[PDB]
């Protein structure tokens, strides 16, 4: 197995177009890896599209295409519509064995981009005399529902003790996350601070808190 | 029309073993087809386990060899999965699926064509612990406004209800969805907006409710 790569999360316009690439960490990407291409909505069973490389199955409309690009595979999507919006995933052979990519998250622009608003809570007083401490990021109101959050101690990242969910679809159609760092009394106590980085669209937001 | 339905336990305890199956129908396990495993974790990605031909030959995930153990049932038209000493990293919903078998001249594993028939899923949890109540802390605080909440931490299962002034408080309610974390417990974050001129005169208490650990909470939010 190798590491396969796609892009985190990309936008299209209803009816614009928009590809999707799908890197390997061995090199170029030949027809013998025979890429295929899986459409996944939230909440149902992944759908077939593209098998080796440029193959539509019986179902996968005409709007979608593969094709190797400088040495990844892609797949070229002509015409948006809203029914396209999901999750993209790539499956390729390597040393016998199939290796699906991390995923993109394709959202059809149904409406502009909405910015996050984010909250930093500490750890309360309640929870240091149990000996635990815990920090809460909130995230919400940001459309599309695509997020990167990270964590750093001072000046250093942090990714041992974190924990965050994925979007889910608030009432207004926009989404909402949060992330949880937990930690230990005595590492709250030795920094002089902790944030909490949101990554949307380009935009980073980012919240801090100290313990004196 | 090639249908795949699997099946599953549903629940299973850790250090265990799980046993999945698959059945075909509208095909024969002794046609030129791969017969697949494929999970996805809660909030991840597909992740390739294996496949099987009805010769017998398999091929496994590199870094799960030494857990998986796929077979086939022809008289049933079934093939099945097994993976031992599973963790609670493995949760997740188990798909099977298939693919043709291709060659080039003689009969040979030519792999030109993919995956075309998905199953329905089935959700497998590996309950790393027990039934536990929440443990309800304080989130004590926009100008105009400002934001107070209550930290449900550490519960288990799933179903917890939330409430703000025994649900007198409905407007500036946002209540997260949980997290799952590693150690198999729960944890969400409720917040209320009020506005910050009646942090002083107005008393905010969150409540919650807890059927399956049968435990009831009401905490009072101080400033602080």
């Known amino acids: 197995q190798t590491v396969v790569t796609q892009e985190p999360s990309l936008t299209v316009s209803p009816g614009g177009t928009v590809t999707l690439t799908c890197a390997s960490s061995?090199?170029?990407?030949?027809?013998?890896?025979?890429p295929n291409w899986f459409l996944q909505k939230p909440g149902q069973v992944p759908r077939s599209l593209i098998y080796?490389?440029?193959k539509r199955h019986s179902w996968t409309p005409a709007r979608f295409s593969g094709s190797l690009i400088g040495g990844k595979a892609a797949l070229t999507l002509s015409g948006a519509q809203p029914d396209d919006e999901g999750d993209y995933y790539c499956?390729?052979?390597?040393?016998?064995?199939?290796?699906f990519g991390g995923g993109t998250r394709l959202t059809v622009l149904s409406q502009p981009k909405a910015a996050p608003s984010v909250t930093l809570f500490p750890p309360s007083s309640e929870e240091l005399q149990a000996n635990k401490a815990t920090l809460v990021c909130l995230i919400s109101d940001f459309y599309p529902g695509a997020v990167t959050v990270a964590w750093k101690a001072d000046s250093s990242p942090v990714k041992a003790g974190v924990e965050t969910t994925t979007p889910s679809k608030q009432s207004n159609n926009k989404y909402a996350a949060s992330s949880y760092l937990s930690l230990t009394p005595e590492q709250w106590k030795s920094h002089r601070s902790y944030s909490c980085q949101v990554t949307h669209e380009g935009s980073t937001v980012e919240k801090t808190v100290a313990p004196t | 029309q090639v249908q795949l339905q699997e099946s599953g336990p549903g629940l299973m305890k850790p250090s265990g073993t799980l046993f999945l199956t698959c059945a075909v129908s509208?095909?024969?396990?002794?046609?030129?087809?791969?017969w697949n495993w494929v999970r996805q974790p809660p909030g991840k990605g597909l992740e390739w386990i294996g496949e099987?031909?009805?010769?017998?030959?398999?091929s496994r995930n590199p870094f799960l060899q030494s857990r998986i153990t796929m077979s086939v049932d022809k008289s049933k038209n079934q093939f099945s999965l097994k993976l031992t000493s599973v963790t609670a990293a493995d949760t997740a919903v188990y798909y099977c699926?298939?693919?043709?078998?291709?060659?080039?001249?003689?009969?040979?594993?030519?792999?030109?064509?993919?995956?075309?028939?998905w199953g329905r899923g089935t959700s497998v949890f590996v309950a790393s612990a027990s039934t536990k109540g929440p443990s309800v802390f304080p989130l004590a605080p926009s100008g105009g406004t400002a934001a107070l909440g209550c930290l449900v931490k550490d519960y288990f299962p799933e179903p917890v209800t939330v409430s703000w002034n025994s649900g007198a408080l409905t407007s500036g309610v946002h209540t997260f969805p949980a997290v799952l974390q590693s150690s198999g417990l729960y944890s969400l974050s409720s917040v209320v907006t009020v506005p910050s001129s009646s942090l002083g005169t107005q008393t905010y208490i969150c409540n919650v409710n807890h059927k399956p650990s049968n435990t009831k909470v009401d905490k009072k939010v101080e400033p602080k």
């Open positions: 499956l390729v052979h390597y040393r016998g064995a199939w290796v």
């Open positions: 061995a090199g170029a990407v030949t027809s013998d890896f025979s």
């Open positions: 080796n490389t440029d």
């Open positions: 509208g095909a024969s396990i002794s046609s030129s087809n791969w």
């Open positions: 099987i031909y009805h010769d017998g030959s398999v």
């Open positions: 699926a298939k693919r043709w078998d291709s060659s080039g001249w003689i009969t040979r594993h030519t792999y030109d064509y993919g995956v075309d028939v």
